[PDB]
Amino acid sequence: RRXXRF
């Protein structure tokens, strides 16, 4: 979630 959201 962190990576795609960022």
Side-chain angles (χ1 to χ4, degrees):
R1 185 181 179 87
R2 170 194 290 181
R5 184 176 64 194
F6 200 87

Short mmCIF file of all heavy atoms in Angstrom, two decimals:
data_model
loop_
_atom_site.label_atom_id
_atom_site.label_comp_id
_atom_site.label_asym_id
_atom_site.label_seq_id
_atom_site.Cartn_x
_atom_site.Cartn_y
_atom_site.Cartn_z
N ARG A 1 0.84 -1.20 0.00
CA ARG A 1 0.00 0.00 0.00
C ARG A 1 0.87 1.25 0.00
O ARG A 1 0.63 2.16 -0.80
CB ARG A 1 -0.95 0.00 1.21
CG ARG A 1 -1.93 1.16 1.22
CD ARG A 1 -2.83 1.12 2.44
NE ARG A 1 -3.77 2.25 2.46
CZ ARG A 1 -4.96 2.27 1.87
NH1 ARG A 1 -5.44 1.26 1.18
NH2 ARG A 1 -5.69 3.36 1.97
N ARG A 2 1.88 1.29 0.87
CA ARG A 2 2.83 2.40 0.92
C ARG A 2 3.35 2.73 -0.47
O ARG A 2 3.32 3.88 -0.90
CB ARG A 2 4.04 2.03 1.79
CG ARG A 2 5.19 3.03 1.72
CD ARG A 2 6.48 2.47 2.31
NE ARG A 2 6.41 2.31 3.76
CZ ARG A 2 7.40 1.87 4.52
NH1 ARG A 2 8.57 1.51 4.03
NH2 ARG A 2 7.21 1.79 5.82
N UNK A 3 3.88 1.68 -1.16
CA UNK A 3 4.68 1.84 -2.38
C UNK A 3 3.83 2.36 -3.54
O UNK A 3 4.16 3.34 -4.18
CB UNK A 3 5.43 0.53 -2.70
N UNK A 4 2.64 1.71 -3.78
CA UNK A 4 1.69 2.13 -4.85
C UNK A 4 1.08 3.52 -4.56
O UNK A 4 0.92 4.34 -5.44
CB UNK A 4 0.62 1.05 -5.09
N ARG A 5 0.73 3.77 -3.24
CA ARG A 5 0.22 5.07 -2.78
C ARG A 5 1.23 6.19 -3.01
O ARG A 5 0.86 7.29 -3.41
CB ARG A 5 -0.14 4.97 -1.30
CG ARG A 5 -0.78 6.21 -0.69
CD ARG A 5 -1.17 5.95 0.75
NE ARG A 5 0.00 5.69 1.59
CZ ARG A 5 -0.03 5.18 2.82
NH1 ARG A 5 -1.15 4.81 3.41
NH2 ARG A 5 1.11 4.99 3.46
N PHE A 6 2.50 5.91 -2.72
CA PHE A 6 3.58 6.87 -2.93
C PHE A 6 3.86 7.14 -4.41
O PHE A 6 4.00 8.28 -4.83
CB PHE A 6 4.84 6.36 -2.22
CG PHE A 6 5.86 7.42 -1.94
CD1 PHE A 6 5.79 8.18 -0.78
CD2 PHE A 6 6.92 7.64 -2.82
CE1 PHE A 6 6.78 9.11 -0.47
CE2 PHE A 6 7.92 8.56 -2.51
CZ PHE A 6 7.85 9.30 -1.33
#
